[PDB]
Structures are given as structure tokens and as C-alpha cells.
Design a protein around this ligand. Structure first.
Ligand SMILES: NC(=O)c1ccc[n+]([C@@H]2O[C@H](COP(=O)([O-])OP(=O)(O)OC[C@H]3O[C@@H](n4cnc5c(N)ncnc54)[C@H](OP(=O)(O)O)[C@@H]3O)[C@@H](O)[C@H]2O)c1
Ligand SMILES: NC(=O)c1ccc[n+]([C@@H]2O[C@H](COP(=O)([O-])OP(=O)(O)OC[C@H]3O[C@@H](n4cnc5c(N)ncnc54)[C@H](OP(=O)(O)O)[C@@H]3O)[C@@H](O)[C@H]2O)c1
Ligand SMILES: NC(=O)c1ccc[n+]([C@@H]2O[C@H](COP(=O)([O-])OP(=O)(O)OC[C@H]3O[C@@H](n4cnc5c(N)ncnc54)[C@H](OP(=O)(O)O)[C@@H]3O)[C@@H](O)[C@H]2O)c1
Ligand SMILES: NC(=O)c1ccc[n+]([C@@H]2O[C@H](COP(=O)([O-])OP(=O)(O)OC[C@H]3O[C@@H](n4cnc5c(N)ncnc54)[C@H](OP(=O)(O)O)[C@@H]3O)[C@@H](O)[C@H]2O)c1
Ligand SMILES: Nc1nc(N2CCSCC2)c2cc[nH]c2n1
Ligand SMILES: Nc1nc(N2CCSCC2)c2cc[nH]c2n1
Ligand SMILES: Nc1nc(N2CCSCC2)c2cc[nH]c2n1
Ligand SMILES: Nc1nc(N2CCSCC2)c2cc[nH]c2n1
Ligand SMILES: Nc1nc(N2CCSCC2)c2cc[nH]c2n1
Ligand SMILES: Nc1nc(N2CCSCC2)c2cc[nH]c2n1
Ligand SMILES: Nc1nc(N2CCSCC2)c2cc[nH]c2n1
Ligand SMILES: Nc1nc(N2CCSCC2)c2cc[nH]c2n1
Lengths: 250, 251, 251, 252
């Protein structure tokens, strides 16, 4: 019978492309979402049309708070309830906005940016590992530019840095259970509607390999590799999918 | 006129040695503490005996909470009330204990470990810089040389230190326009717990290529002094390992 | 037409497994060898028995010398000669032995360790690029996961693998405009040879968090295959560890 | 008795600044040079004028060849001959020029010069330095490059050389730690620019640096060297200190 995967922030964009490829590969998927309820439901419908009873949605705010552990336990619980198993966790959900050092409160920004990008991944990893009853693995969506951070994005960058540490820490600690933990680190990918042709072009032009952004599917391809039987000896690795962007000096 | 430094968790061990060396170098010091009031005050008294009116203490919990930003603002404000200036911020205070993946709730652990190691440093950096909006202004973060060879069951602590690395780098870039340098010192094995069995202390000591011993607090403090000095005025965004080669040792 | 690949040091062990997988995926292949001519030829016989005229062999010493550039050009030429195209280059050939700091001369060791691990890959890279719509051109360098926790007495080997990292990154940048991707695969402990003592083999195996075993040659090859595939077409400058977590383990 | 130091490529620019600062701290110095004989002799003159019998010059090509090991052994031997000891080695000499991957010197000469100076000579010097040893504070400092993981276009061999030197720094730190010899590095970003560089190209480099939009002075680089050799760095080994004013942290 078919393995099962949770993908956080899977309603749209990169998380959706990850959910789609996992499903094409034969996974049953939990499509987690926060605000994008319509897109989530529509994706589950599309996927269930392809193979019945292979997709469910699961709503949760991944902002840090005293109930985040419960929410994260519930996401994993929702995979077992629907599919009787949980083979793969993809930590993709992520808040992203500037927090300059010099109308959300600063503690709300901390809770959002650090919760989504780091604490929730940690709690989800905890619950995933504890619920284990095979090719089990976790893939974290990191950031190829983590050591060349954008100006005024401190809290975001801190979250992505903690996510690197979690990836390495959990790889080590979960290895005795046969659970692999790895990361995929995009550079410029699927820039959204709808920043100017200006700023999109400015970022696309930085990319040595083709002067273009990654497609969502290109990011998903690397996730697919890491969860596959072709990556069974791979744990604690973070694969840049950045067309060489992080190698480019000032 | 004499520059001033805030050192967090400065009552004991490594932070104390940092505050002593800064004081010996000519700084006035805010000795921040959480639970260690008696040692904090004892340090302040010793330093004030050396030079009157050069050391004050400041108490705060640096666990993450709704009140942390105001607590951090108060710490910076306190250096300005005492000394009229704040030249140097040393983020040293840190909670440290295991949080295995498989008394305290996990969200408390998050609050303490990510609060002390990362969020408090960030809020302190904001407040420090906001107050600055021949001066040699800088921040030094106490990191961890073993951050990419993490210890078993220390994921939250490790996550905290990794975030601290990101902060060190992001703030270096963002504050460079104000002449504020931001750097780190990354100990390997330094001061071991008093209560740790000497036999267990020795398993750690034996891992260190250089001398098969832990770093003194003073050796950690030496790197901090360098980073804040006029000899490091082009250095920002750098994290100096002070680890006796430990991080280079394979399994 | 079927794409073609050059694999250096392909007669045995990891290079053989890479050659076989590329061939299984539909590539024609040049099996480069230095001393292992019998094994290179049995490999080509096997592969050509599956699909005719799809494997050839090519001999060369990859030690640095006055003739190395010409040898490297000839390797790439052998692929164009045999197959009309060269889509993939896998730099796998590598000399490996200790060079303590305190009967080959030291300069012969420099030539072999740095030649095979760094200089020949640079020259092969030059010749590969010089010879070049819907193509998928890439280079994969066999690096080393333990490059920043190097083994005692292996400075020149380690220097060579460090230089290969540099090449991987420099070449990814410089060849990107040509559509040529350049990536690395970094084993930890893989296919420990028959020669080595079993207690020393067991020591290395026991260090590996994921299964306390070495990687098979096929496991290393899987990562190579991924990197040369259409599934990695936005990936350049990346080095993928295939090490079962070994590099993450502290002293 | 005063300690002694070898500084490679020390006749001018950063290497000079290092030798001068070491000398001011109380070291006797061997000023190595290759082609800049006049500048080297002029430096030794000044230092000797400050304290008699405290500087000597030593000529050597550090291009890789089968006699490079002898040449490096002789550099260390010259420090012992002049001063009776050798406490500090600074590996500063370096060839630097592009070597484009797609199309003067043959490529094998370019390999020998770029990889020789930046990596192999440091290795051989380190071997000889350790081999010649018996409150000592023995150390090696390697001049690295903060941009090593964001390399400049068409500088493959140079970058390979600097990467190899990182590996040496790390490997030698571990292997020489038992002898009390620390090995560390200093990694400039943009420091002293070429005389001939057009001030427009110079300003393009300057404007990249977050801390001050200016290049590091030679003294700023030397300051980090001096820290690493001092008693204030006695637990530090295997460490590479960027002196780059934030440049390596700046994205494309
Ligand atoms: N795009 C890039 O160029 C790029 C570059 C580097 C790294 N990455 C990383 O790659 C991953 C995917 O990137 P992306 O651009 O597709 O991400 P994105 O669109 O910015 O966000 C992905 C999803 O995260 C979810 N999310 C945000 N805040 C949340 C919260 N408080 N609780 C729960 N979920 C929340 C949202 O769900 P709802 O829509 O359901 O609210 C959102 O759709 C991210 O981890 C990102 O940081 C992307
Ligand atoms: N010792 C080592 O081997 C080692 C190794 C690697 C890195 N480091 C780093 O170097 C630094 C110094 O190490 P250390 O061993 O001296 O540190 P430590 O003794 O564990 O902690 C230093 C101080 O942190 C303060 N602290 C802890 N929790 C706090 C909270 N919730 N709010 C406010 N302050 C709090 C405490 O102050 P009170 O006592 O006043 O409560 C404590 O004395 C730390 O950042 C540490 O992570 C140390
Ligand atoms: N095995 C591991 O645990 C491990 C760990 C980390 C990294 N790696 C890397 O992964 C790659 C494959 O490892 P491996 O253990 O399979 O390699 P290996 O057996 O040591 O050597 C591979 C081949 O390299 C060729 N070679 C050696 N010296 C040469 C020279 N002077 N000129 C031309 N060719 C020469 C040999 O070809 P002939 O037999 O034809 O002479 C040899 O069969 C290497 O790059 C290695 O550094 C391996
Ligand atoms: N300048 C920068 O912005 C910068 C940036 C990053 C890193 N660095 C590093 O910092 C160090 C000093 O930089 P720099 O600009 O002062 O260096 P440099 O002037 O390019 O070179 C220093 C010396 O190296 C010696 N040298 C060159 N080729 C040689 C050979 N074949 N044999 C022996 N010696 C040779 C030369 O000695 P003679 O003049 O006597 O012939 C030269 O004076 C270098 O290791 C460099 O890579 C500098
Ligand atoms: N969560 C998230 N979204 C991102 N987006 C969506 C908002 S606009 C630009 C791409 C990026 C980009 C780099 N890291 C990111 N992380
Ligand atoms: N990897 C990445 N890309 C970024 N870009 C390009 C993708 S879309 C928005 C700006 C930013 C911005 C802040 N941190 C970032 N990290
Ligand atoms: N640098 C470092 N040292 C550690 N040691 C040695 C010092 S005292 C306690 C254990 C630990 C433990 C978890 N993370 C650590 N990081
Ligand atoms: N905050 C903190 N405390 C530490 N302690 C606890 C008090 S005494 C033994 C060291 C260590 C050790 C490595 N990283 C650490 N971080
Ligand atoms: N070229 C090469 N061969 C290796 N071999 C063959 C000889 S014995 C150990 C496996 C190893 C091992 C780590 N890096 C290596 N590189
Ligand atoms: N990755 C790796 N493995 C090594 N091992 C384990 C494989 S077989 C021989 C020792 C060594 C030895 C020196 N450099 C090495 N690098
Ligand atoms: N040996 C060396 N020389 C350099 N010089 C002197 C010649 S022209 C360019 C500046 C630079 C510059 C960056 N890394 C360098 N390494
Ligand atoms: N650190 C650094 N600076 C560079 N610059 C700035 C200083 S002067 C010459 C160009 C170059 C050039 C090639 N590799 C370099 N590395």
C-alpha cells in the first residue's frame, strides 16, 4: 500500500508543486494550509480526482504560541487519521517580510517569522518521530542565501538559520530510527504577482544559470530526490537549487 | 571619557571574565544577571573598588515573552542612565539543557532556549542601535564552535545558536552604515559545569587537539577584547572560533 | 542521439558504479583508467554486450606534469571521437595516501595528490568546456564530506579536495553562461577496500549515524545520476553529501 | 631573547605591514622577497636602523618545482642562521592573475605559480618550520581570501590555491597541535588595490564594502595577524578570521 506525506503551506506555489509531485510519485498527501482554504480544497479535489481517497486538507496557524505544539501534533495526527501512516514530512510553510533593526508588534513578528520557519518545523519533527509505529524522511525548505542575507530581514534569516541547525540536529538524533532529515535551499524561485518587472528583473538578472528564477517544479524535483530510494544514505544534507546565485560576489 | 559596555549573563564564568577584561581595558560596565544577584553585586563592588562609579548591575529574565522587548530596552537604557553612553553590547547570557525529539513544557523550553540565545540578542541589538540613531561601537555574540557538529538531544539550543549566527551576519550588514560592527566569539569546550564528574570533564578535555584542555574564561574574553578594540575596526560579520581545534576533529 | 559521458578512474569501485548507472540511464561512456586496464576492458565488454559500441576505454596518468594538459585534452577528444559529443564529465579518479608534516619524494606526492584531485579536473574542465538548445551539459566532481574535519597526516590529499571544492564553485560560475552545470558529490565512508584491517574498517563504519555502515558504490552513483539528470537542471555549484550524517558527528 | 618571524612576500604592501608590525612588537624578522630586492633591502635597512641586527632579507621563488622543498627549507634555515630560532611563520606571498577556463604563460607554469605560491610553498614551509623546532609561542598564519566561496570570474587556479590553503590551515592545525604549534589564517576581502587599477575600477570594488565603502589598509590586515600570533590567541588554532568589512556577506 501507498506511503503518506505531509506538506506544510501546500495550497499554493512551491508547496503545491511539492504535493503534486509527491502524489504523482504515489504518495497520499496531507495538504496543510493557513489562509488559502479555497486553493487547498481545490488541490485536494484535483488530486482525489486522479486517485480516490489520496489527499486531505489540514488547516493550521504555525505562528509560535503556547498551542503550536498541539497544532503541530494535530497536523501529524491528521495524516495517521486519513492514511494510517506518515512517511514523509516537508516543512515548507514560511512567513517572509522585513523587520528592520532601526503595524505588527515586534513579538508578533518574532512569533510568525521564527515560528513558521523554525519552531513549527521542530515541533512537527518531534510529533512525526514520536508517532512512528519503509523510507521515512523529512525535507526542510531552507534558503540558499542564508549566509548572504537581505537587508532588514534579520528575523527571517534567523529563522532560516535555525532551520539549518534543526536539519543537522534532527538528522543526527533521528538516524537511529532510520528517519533521514535533509533540506532543499532555493535561491530565486517563482516570484509572485506582482512586484514590478523592475524588482523581479533585478533578482532574475543575478542568476548565473540562465538569468531566471527556479520554477516550483524544479524546487520539487530536489525534494522528490531526497525522499526517494536513490537518497537512502543521504541525511543532514542541504541541496541548493539556486542556479549558482549564492556563489555570486557583491 | 570612558566607553561603556553591556555584558549579559555577566555574574559568573565566561560573562564575568568578559566584564572584568572590559573593565581592565577602561570600560564602564553594566553587569546584567538573571538569578545570580549575589555574584553580580560582588563583581560590581570589586570593580567599583578598582575605580569608583564604573560598574552597575541590571536584572532581567531574557526568556522570550510579551515583555522581552521592554526588558531589553531597559537593559540598554540602563547603560545610558549610568554612563551617558553605550559603546559595546556583549550577548553572552544563554540557557542550555537537552530537549530530546523522542517539569518544563516544550513551549517554555522554546521560550528559554530561543529567547536567551537568539531573540534577546536581536531585541538588544535593536535597542542598542536605536540609541545610536573616534567612537568604536560594536556588538559581540557568544556563539558555539560546535554548531555544525551538534550534540545529541540539543536541537533547540543548537537552533538558538544557529539563529545567533544569522543575527550576527544580518546585523553586521544592516548596522555597518552606522559604524556598528557585529561579530562573534565561538567557544568549543570552555568552562565545564562544577558539578560535572571530573571523569566526564576529562572525556571533553581529551577531545581538544591543542593541550587536551578546555579554554579558560579569560581566553574567551581575550577574543572579545580583540573584537571590540581599535585593532579590529575593519572586522564585521566575523565569528572567531576559540576552540583549540575541536571543531576540526572528525568522529 | 544518446548523450555521452566521461568518467575518470572508472575501472573499479565508485567510478565503475557511476559508469554502469550512466550506461543504464542511456549514456554512452568513456571508461578512463590508469593502471586498471583489464578491469576497464571487462567493464566495456559488459556494457557493449548490453548495447553495442556504447563503451570505450581511455588510458591516462592524471599526475601533474608537463604532459597532463595534453593527456586531459585527449580524454575529452576520445569522447568526441567515439561518440560525436561529450555531455557529461565525472571527475572521480583520485590518489589517496598520507603525507605527514613531520619512497616517493614530497614533490611526486604533490604531483599525484594535487594532480589527480584538483589539477586534472581543472584541465578536463577546460577541455570539456572548450569543445562545446535542449542539451543538458554538466560536470560532477567527486569531493569528500570530511573536507573540514580532515584526517591526521593527510594534508596534501585534503588540500587537493579543498581545491576541487574551489574548482566546482569557480567553474559553476564561469561556465553557467554556456549552459554547463558544475556540481559535486561528497562521500563520507564508502566501499572500504579489502586491504584495510577489519578493526579499522569497523571503527570507520561505527562512526556513521545512519545504519553504522559505509555507502555502497551504487549509493554514491545515485547522487551523480541525480545531478546529471533533468531533475537537477537548475542546480549548479552544489555539493551533495552522501555520508549518512558522518560529517555532523563531533569528536 | 627576542622571538623571530619569517614573513613571505614581505618587501611591500600587506607583507611589509605585517613584518613592520611584528618588528614593532619586538620580533626579529626575515623579509622574504622574490623580485622586489630593492624594496626588501630598503625595509630591512629601516628596521635595522630602529634595532640593530633585527632584520634580514631572503630571496626565493615560491613557484612549484622539484627544488621548491629545498627552497622552503632554506627560508626556515635562514631564520635560524640569523636569529637562532623561528617562532612565527606568515605565509603571505602569492601569485595572482586570471586563468580563464575558455580561450603568455603555459598552463603548467600558471599551475606552478598560482598553486605553488598559494598552497604548496605554504605546505613545505610549514613542514620545515615544524621539523626545525625543539614559554614558546609558536604559530603559523596563512593569508587566505574572504571571497573564496564567492569567487571572481576567470580566477579558477588562484581560487583553487586559496581553497587548498584553507585545507592546509585546518589540516596543519590538527597535526601540529601536539607540538604546541597553532595554525590560523587571516582572510582579507578588498584590501590594497593595484597601483595601475583605474580609480573607477577601484571605486567599484570600494562601493561593495558595507563597513565604510573602502578597502582594508595593510595595517588592518596586519592587526589580525598580530592578534593571532599573540598570547591573546593562545587557545586559537584552525581559525580563519575575515578582515573584510562585511564584503563576504553581501549578496549579488
Ligand atoms: N520563493 C523563493 O524565491 C524562495 C527563496 C528561498 C527560500 N524559499 C523557501 O521555499 C519555501 C517555499 O517558498 P514560497 O515562496 O512558495 O513560500 P510563500 O509562498 O511565501 O509561503 C508558503 C506558504 O507558507 C504558509 N504560511 C505563511 N505563514 C504561515 C503561518 N503563520 N502558518 C501557516 N502557514 C503559513 C502560507 O500558507 P497559506 O497561503 O495557506 O496562508 C503560504 O502559502 C519557503 O520555506 C521559503 O522560505 C523560497
Ligand atoms: N562553557 C562552554 O563550554 C561554552 C561552550 C560553547 C559556547 N558557550 C557559550 O558561551 C557563553 C558563556 O558560557 P557559560 O558556560 O559561561 O554560560 P552559562 O553559565 O550557561 O550561562 C551564562 C549566564 O546566562 C544567564 N542566563 C541563563 N538563562 C537566562 C535567562 N532565562 N535570562 C537571563 N539570563 C539567563 C545566567 O545568568 P544568572 O546566573 O544570573 O541566572 C548564566 O549565568 C554562552 O553564550 C554559551 O552558550 C559556552
Ligand atoms: N571510498 C571512500 O570512502 C571515499 C570517501 C570520500 C571521498 N571519496 C572520493 O570518491 C571518489 C572515488 O573513491 P574510490 O575509493 O572509488 O577511489 P579510489 O579507488 O582510491 O581510486 C579511484 C581510481 O582513481 C584512479 N587513479 C588513482 N591515481 C591515479 C593517477 N595517478 N592517474 C589516473 N588515475 C588515478 C585509479 O585508477 P586505476 O585503478 O585505473 O589506476 C583508481 O582506480 C574519489 O574521488 C575519492 O576521493 C571516496
Ligand atoms: N590585496 C587584496 O585585496 C587581497 C585580497 C584578498 C586576499 N589577499 C591576500 O593577502 C596576501 C597579501 O596580498 P597583497 O595584495 O599584498 O599580495 P601581492 O602584492 O600580490 O603579493 C605579495 C608578494 O607575493 C610575492 N610573490 C608573488 N609571486 C611569487 C613567487 N613566484 N615566488 C615568491 N614570491 C612571490 C611577491 O614578492 P616580490 O614582490 O618580492 O616578487 C609579492 O610582493 C596575499 O596572500 C593575498 O592573496 C589580498
Ligand atoms: N516564505 C518565503 N517566501 C518567499 N517569497 C514569497 C514572497 S515574495 C518573494 C518570494 C521567499 C523568498 C525568499 N525566501 C522566501 N520565503
Ligand atoms: N533567497 C532569498 N531571496 C530573496 N529575494 C529574491 C526572491 S523574492 C524576494 C527577494 C530575498 C529577499 C529577502 N531575503 C531573501 N532571500
Ligand atoms: N560547545 C559545546 N560543548 C558542549 N559540551 C562541552 C562543554 S560543557 C557541556 C557539554 C555541548 C553540549 C551540548 N552542546 C554543546 N556545545
Ligand atoms: N549557556 C550555555 N551554558 C553552558 N554550560 C552550562 C553552565 S556550566 C557548563 C557549560 C554551555 C556549554 C556549552 N554551551 C553552553 N551554553
Ligand atoms: N581516492 C580516494 N580513495 C579512497 N579509498 C581508496 C583507498 S583506502 C580508502 C578508500 C578514499 C577514502 C577517502 N577518500 C578517498 N579517496
Ligand atoms: N572521507 C574520508 N574518509 C577517510 N577514511 C574512511 C574511508 S577509508 C580510509 C579513512 C579518510 C581518511 C583520510 N581522509 C579521509 N576522508
Ligand atoms: N596575491 C594577491 N594579490 C592581490 N593583488 C595584488 C596584485 S593585483 C590585485 C591585488 C590580490 C587581490 C586579491 N587577492 C589577491 N592576492
Ligand atoms: N578578495 C578578492 N579581491 C579581488 N579584487 C579586489 C581586490 S584588487 C583585485 C580584485 C579579487 C579578484 C579576484 N579574486 C579576488 N579576491
Amino acid at each position: 500500500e501507498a506511503p503518506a506525506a505531509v506538506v506544510t503551506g501546500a495550497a499554493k506555489r512551491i508547496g503545491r508543486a511539492i504535493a503534486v509531485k509527491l502524489h504523482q510519485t504515489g504518495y497520499r498527501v496531507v495538504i496543510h494550509y493557513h489562509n488559502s482554504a479555497e486553493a487547498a480544497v481545490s488541490l485536494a479535489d484535483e488530486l482525489n480526482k486522479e486517485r480516490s481517497n489520496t489527499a486531505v486538507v489540514c488547516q493550521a496557524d504555525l505562528t509560535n504560541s503556547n498551542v503550536l505544539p498541539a497544532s503541530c501534533e494535530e497536523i501529524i495526527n491528521s495524516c495517521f487519521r486519513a492514511f494510517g501512516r506518515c512517511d514523509v514530512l516537508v516543512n515548507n510553510a514560511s512567513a517572509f517580510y522585513p523587520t528592520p533593526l532601526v503595524g505588527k508588534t515586534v513579538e508578533t513578528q518574532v512569533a510568525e517569522l521564527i515560528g513558521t520557519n523554525a519552531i513549527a518545523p521542530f515541533l512537527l519533527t518531534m510529533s512525526f518521530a514520536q508517532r512512528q509505529k519503509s523510507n521515512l524522511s523529512i525535507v526542510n525548505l531552507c534558503d540558499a542565501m542564508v549566509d548572504q542575507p537581505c537587508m532588514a530581514f534579520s528575523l527571517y534569516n534567523m529563522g532560516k538559520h535555525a532551520l539549518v541547525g534543526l536539519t543537522q540536529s534532527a538528522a543526527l538524533e533521528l538516524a537511529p530510527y532510520g528517519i533521514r532529515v535533509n533540506g532543499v535551499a532555493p535561491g530565486v524561485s517563482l516570484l509572485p504577482v506582482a512586484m514590478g518587472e523592475e524588482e523581479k528583473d533585478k533578482w532574475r538578472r543575478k542568476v548565473p544559470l540562465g538569468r531566471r528564477e527556479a520554477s516550483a517544479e524544479q524546487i520539487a524535483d530536489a525534494v522528490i530526490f531526497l525522499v526517494s530510494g536513490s537518497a537512502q544514505y543521504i541525511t543532514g544534507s542541504i541541496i541548493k537549487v539556486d542556479g549558482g546565485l549564492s556563489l555570486v560576489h557583491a
